[PDB]
Structure formats: structure tokens, C-alpha cells
Amino acid sequence: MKIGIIGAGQLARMLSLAGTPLGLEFHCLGKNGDCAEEVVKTVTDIELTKVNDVVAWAKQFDVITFENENISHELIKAINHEVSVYPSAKAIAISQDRLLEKSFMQDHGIATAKFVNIDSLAKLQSAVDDHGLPAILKTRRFGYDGKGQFVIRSQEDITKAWDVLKDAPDGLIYEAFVDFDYEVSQICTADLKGNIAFYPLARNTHKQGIIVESEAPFENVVLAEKAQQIAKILVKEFAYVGTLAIEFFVKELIVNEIAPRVHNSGHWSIDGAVTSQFENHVRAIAGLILGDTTSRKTVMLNCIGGMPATKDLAALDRVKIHSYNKEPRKGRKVGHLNLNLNDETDEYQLLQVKKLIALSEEI
């Protein structure tokens, strides 16, 4: 069986690392210098606007998936008509647009930040009059890791926010700034028949808009049950197949956003679960029964901008190293480290690895 992946970044790289021992063959749509290249059968560079060419490429394979939900949902529809794409175009369409994503939650009685679609300065003023400050003016369709938005803290920030973002193609959304206690995510995988394998909750820490640490299992039986029920609603309404990620605020579970894919907050599962989020995404789309997800306490630390020297990491002999072999650039995800946490030696190694990261990080 051949699996085509749109994208050749680190998520594609790890899908192939996880899925290759199952005997599956991986092919990417992306560039020669992208980090999945060395671990997949082929990489083919086709502009995603050239729809018939992309569809022609896809038809070489038995099933298609993707690593970035910001892709054209029409392109996915076009492909899916010829060869199965997982997960669904509906999941992509709703998750990639902040207004559609939040409206979906509201339509099913699921809590989110208060939000308003913004089509004018007057509408934004009204949204601020109604739901208060601080708030964020975000684009509906652009943006990664806190970028492409404007935090509104005062009445003067309003016109400034509008003036910066007003011309964003495909529009804008006001979100009330949620004052959360902490953040958690629910990652799960739905197989071809809609059976869901759940991971425990992970507690995630963001720094400057980017995830820097993820801890699992986060043990709270009540929140976990609420999280799982929301996941089930999503899987059913999207007819979802694959790994799905839902990020929450806790303060009451409040949905932050969803990602129809393997997600950074699940990277711990490579070394902390019997079957990782990556192996299970692959098994899901391949029409296979999912792997057991029994998990053990693990911490995941992100390497942003830079990464400690491998020789320094290797000296901490229980740390599991996940370098993506990417180019260091301020703010860029270049790798992560996982560590199982059982005893005091693990705590000691964790301190040493955090120190190493503090010296290599560039956000």
C-alpha cells in the first residue's frame, strides 16, 4: 500500500518513520530540501494551484493525507473524488477558518471564547462594546503561532488593529481574550469505521504563541470525560478518519481550536504510548485496526529556533532525541525531546535538558 502525503515537513517525516515499519510506502508532495525527503520513497514538487497535476500525482497512491489544514479544501474535494483523502474536506473547511470553527462549536453547545465576525471598524467597535477588552483581532484564514493578529488592550488599539488587518483576504474575527488557568489538549485517532482510540489529556505550555512543553498524562478524570465527548461529536459530524487534535482552555473546558491532524501536543506519544499519534494516523488511513494507546508519564520539550548540540543531549542518556534535521531560524520548530518521568534521575536529567534548551532557543 502506498500513502501520499501533501507536505514534506516534520509531521510528514514522523508519519513515515512511524508507518514504514508497518510495511507502508510513503510519497510526499513538497520540495527536495524538505525534511521528510530522506525518510520517504519519493518527493514531488508540484504547485498546489495546478489542480489536475496534483490529482494526477495523487492517483499513483492508495490513500492521501496532509500535514497542513490550510490547504485548499476544493483541492482536497477534487482529489478525494478520485482517491480517498483522510481526513475529510469538511474537517479541513471548518478547522481552517476561525469563524467556521467557533460557529461549529457554538452550534453544538460547546464553549468557546466569545467571538464576532468583523467586516468593518464599526463592527469591531461594537464587538468591543459588547464583549470587552482585552481581546484579539485575528484573521480567519492566516496565521501560525500567534502571528498575523493584533491584541486589543485599549480603545486606541482598536483603529490600529483594524488598520493593520482590514485587508486580510477572507476576513477577520474578534475573540475575547480568555483568562485561563492552564491549557490542555485531547488527541485521538478515529479508524475507518469511526472507532476512536483516545490518548490521555496533555497539559501544554505556550510561550510567545508557540508550544514549548507538553506533559502527559494530565490526570483529571472529569475534564478527560468532557474532552472525549467533544472529540466524539467532532469525529461523527466530520465523518472523521485519522488523528485529530483539540486544544482547550481550562478555567470548565473551553475549546480554543482544533487541528485535523497529528499535532505538536502529541509528540510525547512517540516515547510515551504503546502506539504513537503518528503510527495511529497511518493505521487509521490505511484501513487498519488502531494500536493500543496505553501511556506512561512523559514530558515533551520543543526546540524552537535552535537545538542543543547532539553530543550534549546524548549525555543525558534517558532523553529521547527528535531532531527534524531542519534549518535553524528564529521561531522555527526544529526538533523536540521526550523524556519518560519515573524517578529522581529523570527529574535531574529534565533540569539539565531544560538548561540546554534555554541556551539554544531562539523565539
Added chain:
Amino acid sequence: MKIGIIGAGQLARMLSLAGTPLGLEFHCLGKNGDCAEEVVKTVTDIELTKVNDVVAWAKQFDVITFENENISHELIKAINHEVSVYPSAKAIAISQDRLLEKSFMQDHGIATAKFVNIDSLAKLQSAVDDHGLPAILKTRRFGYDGKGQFVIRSQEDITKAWDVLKDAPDGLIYEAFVDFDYEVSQICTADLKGNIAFYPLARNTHKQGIIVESEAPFENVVLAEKAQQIAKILVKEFAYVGTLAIEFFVKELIVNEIAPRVHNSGHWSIDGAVTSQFENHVRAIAGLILGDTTSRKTVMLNCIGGMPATKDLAALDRVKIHSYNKEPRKGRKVGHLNLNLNDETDEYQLLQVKKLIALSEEI
């Protein structure tokens, strides 16, 4: 850092799977259709007799290793003079020749099967007169998985054995047939400074000359200590860097043979140890500190000749699947399965997977 591997088979494939997340780049010497191709940066097909060409290829990389010790030890010397090869030419030279291997053990007071170098029919007759029957006439330099030899059970089998094998290039050895209770192997990894990371003993079952099952940890504190001391002698005398495998008969530890490489009897460590034999071979040759080897009860089952359907394997959701994506051929190693053994559900899945294997196996 770039690592060159001579060979593109499943051992090379798994070295790259283990070592790629460390941020290392892998290149093989072998063919396009070989099973490591899809997980390494490049594969280059050069006949190993063309020494200057092989050396020219090797010089593109920072360190060289190999998956098959039957390679020309002179070729390794030639390469090593220009770029570091691990492990050593001495380890290759002794392990690849049954007479040299057994003579080494005898020279250091380490037990083996009684053995005699055979250069004539009369010498074989004398070896049988001295050390008895049953015995095996083996080549010194050829043979895999019980092939290329002749078991001598009677006095008529003697001339038959001689007539079959007498012209083997590089000679023959008589070995007394050891009547063992069971077999175990000691796998360990020595870093660049000679520090050794030990795995627990594994209990191995052979069927028709091929390994079919490996169980670890095999708990016997006395045998383990003897095994580790023998490993230390080998690492020191060979100035060994890398993963090393020693196979024993138990009946008293008696050395059977050694392999200067990752070995089938250590495949369990992919899913049963904090750091696998593959990741540690890579860390050793890369000049890195070795990973922790804390282990949990695991069984490894070999898929020979054929492999059960992936959909049938996936249904047993705790089994870890390791398909090499190779072509089924009677007697050929095409994959393995690992299973952690904790509770009764694991025992149940193990029975089901053994049944699946019995129906797919072709030895």
C-alpha cells in the same frame, strides 16, 4: 554528520530508522531495490571488488559501518585508512572465519565446541576418532542459517561430508555437535571510549538453523555475569566500537559464535528497551554517549519466508509490527513482530500471533 553503511538490507534499514531522529544522515552501498532505500538519503551500487571506488564513495561520509561481517577485511582496512570504520577490521577478520573465531576463544580460556581445522579426509577421520559423533563439517567462511555444512552422524557420512565440502574456498572446520539445554545471546554496545552498555540476556529458539523466537530479559544473574565478562574481553581485544552480539549454548556458558553488528536476537530491544541495539550502534559510531538500556519483558517472533497480512496483525493491537518490505522467498527474513509481555491479554495476543505466523511461515 553523515554515516555510510555497507549494505542496504533490513539491518541497514533499522539503523537508519533508529538513527535518523538523532539528526544523522544515512547513505548505503547496495542496490535500488534493497529494503533500506526508502529510509536512507542515498543508495549507491558499487561492486565491492572495485576497492578504490568503494573508498572514494566512503570518503563522502564521516564514519562507516557495515551490516555483514562476511565482507573483505582488506577492503575495510583500505577504507579505514581514509575514513573511520566501526567496528574494527580485527573483529571482522576473527568473526568471519570459524577457525579464527574458535581459536580466539580457546586462546583466552573461553569455552567452545571442540573444533579441528580440516585440510584432508584423514584429518576429518582423526577429528571424528578424537572428539566423536555427531559432529558438523562446516566451511570456515561460507554459510548462513545452517546452510553450507554437513552433519556427520555415522562413519559413512564422513566421506560424504568431505566429498561435498572439500573444495570450499578458504577451508573447513570440524565441530563437535553440542547437546545444549537452551541458547542465549549477549548483545552490548561499546562507545568510542570503550564504555559498554549491556542488554539483558535473550533466550533464543532456532528452528532448522534460523532464529524464530527471542525472549528478553532472560533472568539468570550468574550466566549474565559470565556473558558480560566475555563481552568485555572481546571489546577490549578488538578495540571494539559499536553493537556486538555473542551467541551461547547453555548446558556452563559455551560460546557458539559472535557477530560484530546488530543481530536478530536483539530486535526485541526496538520495543523493549529505552534505547535499542540500533540506536546505540548509531550513537557508538557517531562518537556520542550511549542511551540507557533499561528493559522490559518482550518477545520477538521472526517472519521467515512469508509474513501474516498486516490487517490480521493490526487486529492484535499490542503487537509491534516490523515488516522489512522485502520479497517473500522460502527461508528469507522478511520481518519480525515484538510484543511486551505484562498481563494475560498479552499472552492471549501472543498465541494469536504465533498461529498467524504458523500459517504464513515458509522455511
